[PDB]
Amino acid sequence: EKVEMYIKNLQDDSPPVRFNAAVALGKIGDERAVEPLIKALKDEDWQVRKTAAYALGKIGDERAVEPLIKALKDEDRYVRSRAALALGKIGDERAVEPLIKALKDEDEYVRLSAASALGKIGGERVRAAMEKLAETGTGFARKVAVNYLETHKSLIS
Amino acid sequence: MRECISIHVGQAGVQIGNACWELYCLEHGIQPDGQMPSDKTIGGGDDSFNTFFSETGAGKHVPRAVFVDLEPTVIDEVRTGTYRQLFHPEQLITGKEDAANNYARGHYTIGKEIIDLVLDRIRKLADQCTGLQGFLVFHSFGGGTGSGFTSLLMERLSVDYGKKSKLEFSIYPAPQVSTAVVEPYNSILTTHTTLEHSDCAFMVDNEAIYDICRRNLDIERPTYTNLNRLISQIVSSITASLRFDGALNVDLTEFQTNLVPYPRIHFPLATYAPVISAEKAYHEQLSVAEITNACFEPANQMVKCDPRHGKYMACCLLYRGDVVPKDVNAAIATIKTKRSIQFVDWCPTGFKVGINYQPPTVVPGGDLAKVQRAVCMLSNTTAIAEAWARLDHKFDLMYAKRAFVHWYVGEGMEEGEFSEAREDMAALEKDYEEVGVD
Amino acid sequence: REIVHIQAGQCGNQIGAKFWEVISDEHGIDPTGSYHGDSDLQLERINVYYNEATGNKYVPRAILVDLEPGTMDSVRSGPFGQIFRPDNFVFGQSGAGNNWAKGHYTEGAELVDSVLDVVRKESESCDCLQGFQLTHSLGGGTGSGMGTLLISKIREEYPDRIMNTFSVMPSPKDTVVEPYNATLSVHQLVENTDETYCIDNEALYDICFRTLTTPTYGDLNHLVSATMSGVTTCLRFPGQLNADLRKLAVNMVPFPRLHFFMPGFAPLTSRGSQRALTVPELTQQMFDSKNMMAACDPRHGRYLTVAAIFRGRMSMKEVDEQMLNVQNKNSSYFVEWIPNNVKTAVCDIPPRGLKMSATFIGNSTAIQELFKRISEQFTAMFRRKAFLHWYTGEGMDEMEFTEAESNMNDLVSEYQQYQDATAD
Amino acid sequence: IEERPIEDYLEEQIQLEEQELPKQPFLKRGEGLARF
Ligand SMILES: Nc1nc2c(ncn2[C@@H]2O[C@H](COP(=O)(O)OP(=O)(O)OP(=O)(O)O)[C@@H](O)[C@H]2O)c(=O)[nH]1
Ligand SMILES: Nc1nc2c(ncn2[C@@H]2O[C@H](COP(=O)(O)OP(=O)(O)O)[C@@H](O)[C@H]2O)c(=O)[nH]1
Ligand SMILES: [Mg+2]
């Protein structure tokens, strides 16, 4: 298993080696790379960070939920939007309120990523949060809540 | 999200656009059918390629490309070739009779019969875009369709898509592969009428590509196949930023913001390194320091000129591969000191930098070697006026005796259109002279 | 896409037959009409001169016209006689008697109505008709007189379509009125054709006794057929340079009146001979007056535009080095105000028998020496108004002869104008 | 048919013609320029 070699490369001095180790850790979706890729989410380099966010969506470990919610506050637009799509893939209801706030981001790709992650999570937390947003909210968040409610009706009305 | 539609007009336009789409697929993990299987894809999560490829319900990714030619033999190879199932038949448009190397036939006489179907096929593509950025237009300067039809299409895109950017890839003529004596005429005519329609135009001098092929690739007598292979490798370096996650030139808007301070002077020069022969004996992979230095050798440019007799308005470096930012900062310091590069008076002096860590891609089996790290420098130097002057001087020589003018006049163009275009060129030469003064 | 060929007069039909025998061998089409070739390169652009018939049969897009029956009976007999469409043989039983005025207004106007019908029939089959190609002599009656009539009728019905001619220029080296028909024909050629390949009979005779004892018609025709196959290689085979009649004229004709080309061919072969010519050897001969199909010397005139075609297997780099050297060592005979005027094309397929060749097509101002000879010969018979009663009685105008002679003298005056033109 | 065989005579033939011995519109010079 080259997993251990790629985990050590995640902490390499060379940023493209750290990047290519995150890309490879995502393809070899192993549980041995969850804590290592969670640390690469605190990388100085945005490109390593955004790749670690995708690799953590692929593994789908519940351990990545809380650090991917912190990554939703990241300075970089790719880290916010890839962290959103990773949380959509994990499907943990712990990400419902931070994904609703990400609907107000200045970045278009981050808003669309969060809207689509909420629809991929589903359940009763998202049902209740959209019912509230389609009555008390406005703008993109409002159209997302309305669209969520329309695509989730069991009847024609 | 933010899409780009590519338009390929004429033989050169269609042949280079086909070589570009082939490399895009290889870069993104797309098969000639349009599928992106798990094995073929880069497992990084980067979906920025969706700006160039639409997606069907069956998971087929389709280039947002339109191919136009007044004669069918070039586009018939696209319809039949490897990528016959990559594009929808609706995107491949052919006339029956070509512009016979006459700008007037492509713009007036023949071009007018096909312009509304071309705009309809472009509108069909545009309708699938939630946030279309604009267009990338590939065409020659010397052919009648690439010159004439392009300027007609450019004029119309401005009206139908007012707020949208238009980037060109223009094939600048060369005597080693010249098919017409009237090429300086078409080149000056398409420049004048397209000038206010394009936001940024990348000229590809066929002579510069010929020299790089002979010298770095060891190809004795280069053909279009050889030229288009290096042209596509370079043009794909310039467009990469649009198809991948990055921090520089991420949208068509950013090309003028970073490269074009003065709108008429919108012709950046591109310098690509390293160009290595697949047949070369073992060499150590060239460093960031080495490839950054090659960017300032006029032999590596895709336009024949000398920036050392000229000033800069803008300078961008787009790195690809095993490129360490600390090594790029160190190499740029060496250029900013030990190199004597001169900026124009009211433009900042900084060099903008972009680094995409994914390894460089080449087409398997071609003339080029797979390198560990590459760079494309985009620079707006005043030196590029040398290429304008060469075309202008050849135009002046023939127009002094009204040689071949009758062909254009008898095809819907007025005689005064020749002198009006040459006036615009004389003004553009002066613009380059005015920004370079101390 | 498609070239409609027309062969007017005895010479037009004789050279027309030798043209079809040479291009039919090159394309693999046997005398019956079936494809007996071996490579798909022969059929890629077969539609330019041939129509696909029932089965694998291919019929030439050719119309055969002559006011005498003799040439229609001789075309039918011999090789590839049974390849032409039977209904495309328009032959009158009266004759021309070697007069331009008889062929343009009297016996020509009677038959031209039925010829234009056959022209329409073949042009209606066309998907995208490229233009027309006429083979004819300029000293006779049917070829010179009815030929210039067919050009003007077609120029009115198909105004956009490119008109091209293979015009045989008469030489005394036996008909009294040979320069009268030639001077009247050239007048029409200046106004109605887009490309005129001057095939001088004086040059064919000089290149048969000085270079190659008593030359025959078929000996001059052998040089003609080897020329016609070379100048049409770019149209019959897949190529980048001058692939059609319009793209050729847009590179070869800078001034509308000046569309009179000088053909050249190397190496010079006789009718039935037993060396393999190299690229540098081919290049010098390509630009030598001893290898010209028109009796002119290009060292006395400047080339406005040139087109060179190399056939057979050779180094493209060696052709580049030789074509640059022929233009650098002789830049004194090239026009400075027409940059990159010389265009070179290389076809992998060689001509019949030979392994390597070079066909030259030059629009040089030195051709005013051919038109000077015709003016010196026409004004010799016009000095005393000799035999004008043979053309006056046919219905021609007095000022018609004065306009044909003045328009040709203007062409020579224009050739010297662009010869003495400094770019500076 | 490939076996078909090949100044002062003109001066003598001109004197021989001297012993024995519906205006149709023709082409105008410059009319070829009308197509451009
Ligand atoms: N690099 C490169 N140059 C080409 C190619 N094809 C043609 N050219 C160049 O483009 C010019 C001729 O223009 P073309 O693109 O062939 O013409 P077109 O737009 O089809 O115009 P028409 O054929 O006259 O209707 C010349 O300068 C050629 O050298 C090609 O595949 N690659
Ligand atoms: N090259 C060539 N020239 C010919 C041939 N027959 C006649 N000529 C020339 O054609 C001219 C006479 O025209 P011709 O075709 O015989 O008369 P037409 O039938 O009335 O047009 C003279 O200049 C002849 O030298 C031939 O077979 N080959
Ligand atoms: Mg073309």
PDB file of all heavy atoms in Angstrom, chain C residues 8-12 14-15 66 68 96 98 137 139-144 168 170-171 178 201 204 217 220-221 224, ligand 2, unseen atoms left out:
ATOM      1  N   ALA C   8     -13.276  23.168 -79.256  1.00  0.00           N
ATOM      2  CA  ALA C   8     -13.678  23.779 -80.522  1.00  0.00           C
ATOM      3  C   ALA C   8     -12.590  23.764 -81.599  1.00  0.00           C
ATOM      4  O   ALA C   8     -11.453  24.164 -81.349  1.00  0.00           O
ATOM      5  CB  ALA C   8     -14.146  25.204 -80.283  1.00  0.00           C
ATOM      6  N   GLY C   9     -12.970  23.341 -82.801  1.00  0.00           N
ATOM      7  CA  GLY C   9     -12.070  23.293 -83.944  1.00  0.00           C
ATOM      8  C   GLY C   9     -11.277  22.009 -84.049  1.00  0.00           C
ATOM      9  O   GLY C   9     -11.290  21.195 -83.125  1.00  0.00           O
ATOM     10  N   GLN C  10     -10.575  21.822 -85.180  1.00  0.00           N
ATOM     11  CA  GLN C  10      -9.752  20.639 -85.429  1.00  0.00           C
ATOM     12  C   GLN C  10      -8.576  20.564 -84.451  1.00  0.00           C
ATOM     13  O   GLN C  10      -8.272  19.482 -83.946  1.00  0.00           O
ATOM     14  CB  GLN C  10      -9.256  20.605 -86.886  1.00  0.00           C
ATOM     15  N   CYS C  11      -7.924  21.707 -84.177  1.00  0.00           N
ATOM     16  CA  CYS C  11      -6.812  21.721 -83.229  1.00  0.00           C
ATOM     17  C   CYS C  11      -7.329  21.566 -81.818  1.00  0.00           C
ATOM     18  O   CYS C  11      -6.752  20.806 -81.053  1.00  0.00           O
ATOM     19  CB  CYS C  11      -5.951  22.969 -83.376  1.00  0.00           C
ATOM     20  SG  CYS C  11      -4.591  23.082 -82.179  1.00  0.00           S
ATOM     21  N   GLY C  12      -8.429  22.240 -81.494  1.00  0.00           N
ATOM     22  CA  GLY C  12      -9.054  22.132 -80.185  1.00  0.00           C
ATOM     23  C   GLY C  12      -9.477  20.713 -79.853  1.00  0.00           C
ATOM     24  O   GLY C  12      -9.355  20.281 -78.706  1.00  0.00           O
ATOM     25  N   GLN C  14      -8.098  17.933 -81.495  1.00  0.00           N
ATOM     26  CA  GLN C  14      -6.878  17.126 -81.532  1.00  0.00           C
ATOM     27  C   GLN C  14      -6.132  17.228 -80.194  1.00  0.00           C
ATOM     28  O   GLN C  14      -5.795  16.194 -79.612  1.00  0.00           O
ATOM     29  CB  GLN C  14      -5.980  17.521 -82.718  1.00  0.00           C
ATOM     30  N   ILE C  15      -5.921  18.457 -79.673  1.00  0.00           N
ATOM     31  CA  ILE C  15      -5.290  18.633 -78.359  1.00  0.00           C
ATOM     32  C   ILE C  15      -6.209  18.164 -77.229  1.00  0.00           C
ATOM     33  O   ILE C  15      -5.712  17.660 -76.227  1.00  0.00           O
ATOM     34  CB  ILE C  15      -4.722  20.048 -78.086  1.00  0.00           C
ATOM     35  CG1 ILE C  15      -5.838  21.096 -77.935  1.00  0.00           C
ATOM     36  CG2 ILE C  15      -3.691  20.438 -79.129  1.00  0.00           C
ATOM     37  CD1 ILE C  15      -5.376  22.465 -77.528  1.00  0.00           C
ATOM     38  N   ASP C  66     -17.070  20.997 -83.637  1.00  0.00           N
ATOM     39  CA  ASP C  66     -16.357  21.318 -84.877  1.00  0.00           C
ATOM     40  C   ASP C  66     -17.328  21.375 -86.063  1.00  0.00           C
ATOM     41  O   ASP C  66     -18.196  20.515 -86.207  1.00  0.00           O
ATOM     42  CB  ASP C  66     -15.182  20.363 -85.169  1.00  0.00           C
ATOM     43  CG  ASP C  66     -14.227  20.850 -86.258  1.00  0.00           C
ATOM     44  OD1 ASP C  66     -14.341  22.025 -86.673  1.00  0.00           O
ATOM     45  OD2 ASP C  66     -13.369  20.055 -86.696  1.00  0.00           O
ATOM     46  N   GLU C  68     -16.761  20.665 -89.077  1.00  0.00           N
ATOM     47  CA  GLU C  68     -16.428  19.620 -90.046  1.00  0.00           C
ATOM     48  C   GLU C  68     -16.653  18.254 -89.383  1.00  0.00           C
ATOM     49  O   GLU C  68     -16.364  18.071 -88.196  1.00  0.00           O
ATOM     50  CB  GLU C  68     -14.969  19.753 -90.518  1.00  0.00           C
ATOM     51  CG  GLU C  68     -14.731  20.926 -91.448  1.00  0.00           C
ATOM     52  CD  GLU C  68     -13.278  21.353 -91.520  1.00  0.00           C
ATOM     53  OE1 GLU C  68     -12.712  21.721 -90.464  1.00  0.00           O
ATOM     54  OE2 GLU C  68     -12.704  21.311 -92.633  1.00  0.00           O
ATOM     55  N   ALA C  96     -15.676  25.751 -91.614  1.00  0.00           N
ATOM     56  CA  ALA C  96     -15.299  27.125 -91.277  1.00  0.00           C
ATOM     57  C   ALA C  96     -14.494  27.840 -92.359  1.00  0.00           C
ATOM     58  O   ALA C  96     -14.520  29.070 -92.423  1.00  0.00           O
ATOM     59  CB  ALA C  96     -14.528  27.145 -89.973  1.00  0.00           C
ATOM     60  N   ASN C  98     -11.434  28.422 -92.429  1.00  0.00           N
ATOM     61  CA  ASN C  98     -10.383  29.168 -91.736  1.00  0.00           C
ATOM     62  C   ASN C  98     -10.620  30.692 -91.674  1.00  0.00           C
ATOM     63  O   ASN C  98      -9.695  31.468 -91.916  1.00  0.00           O
ATOM     64  CB  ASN C  98      -8.998  28.841 -92.297  1.00  0.00           C
ATOM     65  CG  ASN C  98      -8.514  27.460 -91.931  1.00  0.00           C
ATOM     66  OD1 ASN C  98      -9.201  26.678 -91.257  1.00  0.00           O
ATOM     67  ND2 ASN C  98      -7.307  27.130 -92.362  1.00  0.00           N
ATOM     68  N   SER C 137      -7.352  26.464 -81.174  1.00  0.00           N
ATOM     69  CA  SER C 137      -6.290  27.148 -81.916  1.00  0.00           C
ATOM     70  C   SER C 137      -6.776  28.572 -82.245  1.00  0.00           C
ATOM     71  O   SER C 137      -7.987  28.805 -82.277  1.00  0.00           O
ATOM     72  CB  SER C 137      -5.986  26.409 -83.215  1.00  0.00           C
ATOM     73  OG  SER C 137      -7.172  26.062 -83.914  1.00  0.00           O
ATOM     74  N   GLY C 139      -5.650  30.389 -85.139  1.00  0.00           N
ATOM     75  CA  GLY C 139      -5.450  30.683 -86.554  1.00  0.00           C
ATOM     76  C   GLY C 139      -6.506  30.143 -87.508  1.00  0.00           C
ATOM     77  O   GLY C 139      -6.544  30.524 -88.688  1.00  0.00           O
ATOM     78  N   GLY C 140      -7.360  29.251 -87.015  1.00  0.00           N
ATOM     79  CA  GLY C 140      -8.400  28.658 -87.849  1.00  0.00           C
ATOM     80  C   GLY C 140      -9.693  29.443 -87.902  1.00  0.00           C
ATOM     81  O   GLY C 140      -9.703  30.670 -87.793  1.00  0.00           O
ATOM     82  N   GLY C 141     -10.786  28.722 -88.064  1.00  0.00           N
ATOM     83  CA  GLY C 141     -12.107  29.321 -88.135  1.00  0.00           C
ATOM     84  C   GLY C 141     -13.014  28.853 -87.020  1.00  0.00           C
ATOM     85  O   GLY C 141     -13.623  29.682 -86.343  1.00  0.00           O
ATOM     86  N   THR C 142     -13.114  27.523 -86.813  1.00  0.00           N
ATOM     87  CA  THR C 142     -13.981  26.965 -85.772  1.00  0.00           C
ATOM     88  C   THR C 142     -13.426  27.249 -84.372  1.00  0.00           C
ATOM     89  O   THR C 142     -14.149  27.744 -83.512  1.00  0.00           O
ATOM     90  CB  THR C 142     -14.226  25.451 -85.966  1.00  0.00           C
ATOM     91  OG1 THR C 142     -14.426  25.124 -87.340  1.00  0.00           O
ATOM     92  CG2 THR C 142     -15.374  24.945 -85.115  1.00  0.00           C
ATOM     93  N   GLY C 143     -12.151  26.944 -84.166  1.00  0.00           N
ATOM     94  CA  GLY C 143     -11.498  27.126 -82.885  1.00  0.00           C
ATOM     95  C   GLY C 143     -11.379  28.571 -82.467  1.00  0.00           C
ATOM     96  O   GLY C 143     -11.747  28.916 -81.340  1.00  0.00           O
ATOM     97  N   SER C 144     -10.856  29.425 -83.359  1.00  0.00           N
ATOM     98  CA  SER C 144     -10.657  30.824 -83.008  1.00  0.00           C
ATOM     99  C   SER C 144     -11.941  31.652 -83.041  1.00  0.00           C
ATOM    100  O   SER C 144     -12.221  32.349 -82.070  1.00  0.00           O
ATOM    101  CB  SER C 144      -9.556  31.452 -83.852  1.00  0.00           C
ATOM    102  OG  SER C 144      -9.933  31.576 -85.210  1.00  0.00           O
ATOM    103  N   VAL C 168      -3.958  28.004 -78.502  1.00  0.00           N
ATOM    104  CA  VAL C 168      -2.842  27.754 -79.410  1.00  0.00           C
ATOM    105  C   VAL C 168      -2.537  28.990 -80.265  1.00  0.00           C
ATOM    106  O   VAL C 168      -3.361  29.367 -81.088  1.00  0.00           O
ATOM    107  CB  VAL C 168      -3.126  26.527 -80.303  1.00  0.00           C
ATOM    108  CG1 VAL C 168      -1.928  26.212 -81.183  1.00  0.00           C
ATOM    109  CG2 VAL C 168      -3.516  25.317 -79.465  1.00  0.00           C
ATOM    110  N   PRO C 170      -0.958  30.804 -83.347  1.00  0.00           N
ATOM    111  CA  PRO C 170      -0.396  30.414 -84.658  1.00  0.00           C
ATOM    112  C   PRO C 170       0.978  30.992 -85.028  1.00  0.00           C
ATOM    113  O   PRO C 170       1.350  32.095 -84.622  1.00  0.00           O
ATOM    114  CB  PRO C 170      -1.473  30.858 -85.656  1.00  0.00           C
ATOM    115  CG  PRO C 170      -2.250  31.897 -84.959  1.00  0.00           C
ATOM    116  CD  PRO C 170      -2.244  31.509 -83.507  1.00  0.00           C
ATOM    117  N   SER C 171       1.735  30.218 -85.817  1.00  0.00           N
ATOM    118  CA  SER C 171       3.066  30.591 -86.282  1.00  0.00           C
ATOM    119  C   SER C 171       3.217  30.240 -87.756  1.00  0.00           C
ATOM    120  O   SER C 171       2.763  29.181 -88.194  1.00  0.00           O
ATOM    121  CB  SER C 171       4.126  29.836 -85.489  1.00  0.00           C
ATOM    122  OG  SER C 171       5.422  29.969 -86.050  1.00  0.00           O
ATOM    123  N   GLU C 178      -3.885  33.792 -91.033  1.00  0.00           N
ATOM    124  CA  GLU C 178      -3.611  33.304 -89.676  1.00  0.00           C
ATOM    125  C   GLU C 178      -3.466  34.441 -88.633  1.00  0.00           C
ATOM    126  O   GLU C 178      -4.081  34.329 -87.570  1.00  0.00           O
ATOM    127  CB  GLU C 178      -2.405  32.348 -89.637  1.00  0.00           C
ATOM    128  CG  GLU C 178      -2.647  31.034 -90.355  1.00  0.00           C
ATOM    129  CD  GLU C 178      -3.207  29.930 -89.486  1.00  0.00           C
ATOM    130  OE1 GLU C 178      -2.664  29.725 -88.378  1.00  0.00           O
ATOM    131  OE2 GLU C 178      -4.177  29.263 -89.910  1.00  0.00           O
ATOM    132  N   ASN C 201       2.699  27.868 -81.140  1.00  0.00           N
ATOM    133  CA  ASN C 201       3.124  26.839 -82.094  1.00  0.00           C
ATOM    134  C   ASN C 201       4.572  27.020 -82.569  1.00  0.00           C
ATOM    135  O   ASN C 201       5.215  26.047 -82.969  1.00  0.00           O
ATOM    136  CB  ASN C 201       2.173  26.779 -83.283  1.00  0.00           C
ATOM    137  CG  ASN C 201       1.255  25.587 -83.243  1.00  0.00           C
ATOM    138  OD1 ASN C 201       1.545  24.564 -82.609  1.00  0.00           O
ATOM    139  ND2 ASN C 201       0.130  25.693 -83.932  1.00  0.00           N
ATOM    140  N   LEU C 204       6.764  25.372 -79.937  1.00  0.00           N
ATOM    141  CA  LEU C 204       6.682  23.922 -80.041  1.00  0.00           C
ATOM    142  C   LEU C 204       7.590  23.435 -81.179  1.00  0.00           C
ATOM    143  O   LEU C 204       8.278  22.428 -81.020  1.00  0.00           O
ATOM    144  CB  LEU C 204       5.230  23.480 -80.283  1.00  0.00           C
ATOM    145  CG  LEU C 204       4.225  23.860 -79.202  1.00  0.00           C
ATOM    146  CD1 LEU C 204       2.840  23.451 -79.598  1.00  0.00           C
ATOM    147  CD2 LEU C 204       4.583  23.236 -77.867  1.00  0.00           C
ATOM    148  N   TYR C 217       2.491  16.948 -86.366  1.00  0.00           N
ATOM    149  CA  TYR C 217       1.469  17.562 -85.523  1.00  0.00           C
ATOM    150  C   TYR C 217       1.448  16.871 -84.161  1.00  0.00           C
ATOM    151  O   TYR C 217       1.425  17.552 -83.144  1.00  0.00           O
ATOM    152  CB  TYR C 217       0.086  17.487 -86.192  1.00  0.00           C
ATOM    153  N   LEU C 220       4.239  18.061 -81.829  1.00  0.00           N
ATOM    154  CA  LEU C 220       3.912  19.315 -81.153  1.00  0.00           C
ATOM    155  C   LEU C 220       2.849  19.039 -80.071  1.00  0.00           C
ATOM    156  O   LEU C 220       2.925  19.595 -78.980  1.00  0.00           O
ATOM    157  CB  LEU C 220       3.386  20.354 -82.154  1.00  0.00           C
ATOM    158  CG  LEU C 220       4.199  20.575 -83.427  1.00  0.00           C
ATOM    159  CD1 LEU C 220       3.595  21.672 -84.245  1.00  0.00           C
ATOM    160  CD2 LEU C 220       5.631  20.947 -83.118  1.00  0.00           C
ATOM    161  N   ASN C 221       1.879  18.155 -80.381  1.00  0.00           N
ATOM    162  CA  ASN C 221       0.809  17.704 -79.493  1.00  0.00           C
ATOM    163  C   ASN C 221       1.349  16.937 -78.284  1.00  0.00           C
ATOM    164  O   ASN C 221       0.715  16.954 -77.232  1.00  0.00           O
ATOM    165  CB  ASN C 221      -0.183  16.824 -80.258  1.00  0.00           C
ATOM    166  CG  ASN C 221      -1.239  17.595 -81.010  1.00  0.00           C
ATOM    167  OD1 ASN C 221      -1.250  18.828 -81.024  1.00  0.00           O
ATOM    168  ND2 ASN C 221      -2.159  16.879 -81.652  1.00  0.00           N
ATOM    169  N   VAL C 224       2.294  19.600 -75.917  1.00  0.00           N
ATOM    170  CA  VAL C 224       1.038  20.181 -75.447  1.00  0.00           C
ATOM    171  C   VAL C 224       0.395  19.316 -74.347  1.00  0.00           C
ATOM    172  O   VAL C 224       0.101  19.836 -73.274  1.00  0.00           O
ATOM    173  CB  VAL C 224       0.055  20.443 -76.617  1.00  0.00           C
ATOM    174  CG1 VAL C 224      -1.319  20.863 -76.104  1.00  0.00           C
ATOM    175  CG2 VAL C 224       0.609  21.492 -77.568  1.00  0.00           C
TER     176      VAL C 224
HETATM  177  N1  LIG E   2      -0.575  21.788 -81.920  1.00  0.00           N
HETATM  178  C1  LIG E   2      -1.402  21.618 -82.954  1.00  0.00           C
HETATM  179  N2  LIG E   2      -1.724  22.660 -83.717  1.00  0.00           N
HETATM  180  C2  LIG E   2      -2.528  22.325 -84.744  1.00  0.00           C
HETATM  181  C3  LIG E   2      -3.025  21.077 -85.068  1.00  0.00           C
HETATM  182  N3  LIG E   2      -3.811  21.147 -86.208  1.00  0.00           N
HETATM  183  C4  LIG E   2      -3.779  22.415 -86.542  1.00  0.00           C
HETATM  184  N4  LIG E   2      -3.027  23.186 -85.693  1.00  0.00           N
HETATM  185  C5  LIG E   2      -2.844  24.647 -85.744  1.00  0.00           C
HETATM  186  O1  LIG E   2      -4.122  25.255 -85.699  1.00  0.00           O
HETATM  187  C6  LIG E   2      -4.179  26.374 -86.608  1.00  0.00           C
HETATM  188  C7  LIG E   2      -5.250  26.134 -87.644  1.00  0.00           C
HETATM  189  O2  LIG E   2      -6.516  25.958 -86.973  1.00  0.00           O
HETATM  190  P1  LIG E   2      -7.490  24.677 -87.170  1.00  0.00           P
HETATM  191  O3  LIG E   2      -7.821  24.035 -85.879  1.00  0.00           O
HETATM  192  O4  LIG E   2      -6.820  23.646 -88.095  1.00  0.00           O
HETATM  193  O5  LIG E   2      -8.844  25.137 -87.875  1.00  0.00           O
HETATM  194  P2  LIG E   2     -10.374  25.007 -87.449  1.00  0.00           P
HETATM  195  O6  LIG E   2     -10.822  23.579 -87.440  1.00  0.00           O
HETATM  196  O7  LIG E   2     -11.181  25.837 -88.458  1.00  0.00           O
HETATM  197  O8  LIG E   2     -10.449  25.675 -86.087  1.00  0.00           O
HETATM  198  C8  LIG E   2      -2.759  26.556 -87.142  1.00  0.00           C
HETATM  199  O9  LIG E   2      -2.061  27.534 -86.379  1.00  0.00           O
HETATM  200  C9  LIG E   2      -2.168  25.148 -87.021  1.00  0.00           C
HETATM  201  O10 LIG E   2      -0.749  25.146 -86.895  1.00  0.00           O
HETATM  202  C10 LIG E   2      -2.680  19.967 -84.223  1.00  0.00           C
HETATM  203  O11 LIG E   2      -3.044  18.797 -84.340  1.00  0.00           O
HETATM  204  N5  LIG E   2      -1.856  20.346 -83.181  1.00  0.00           N
END
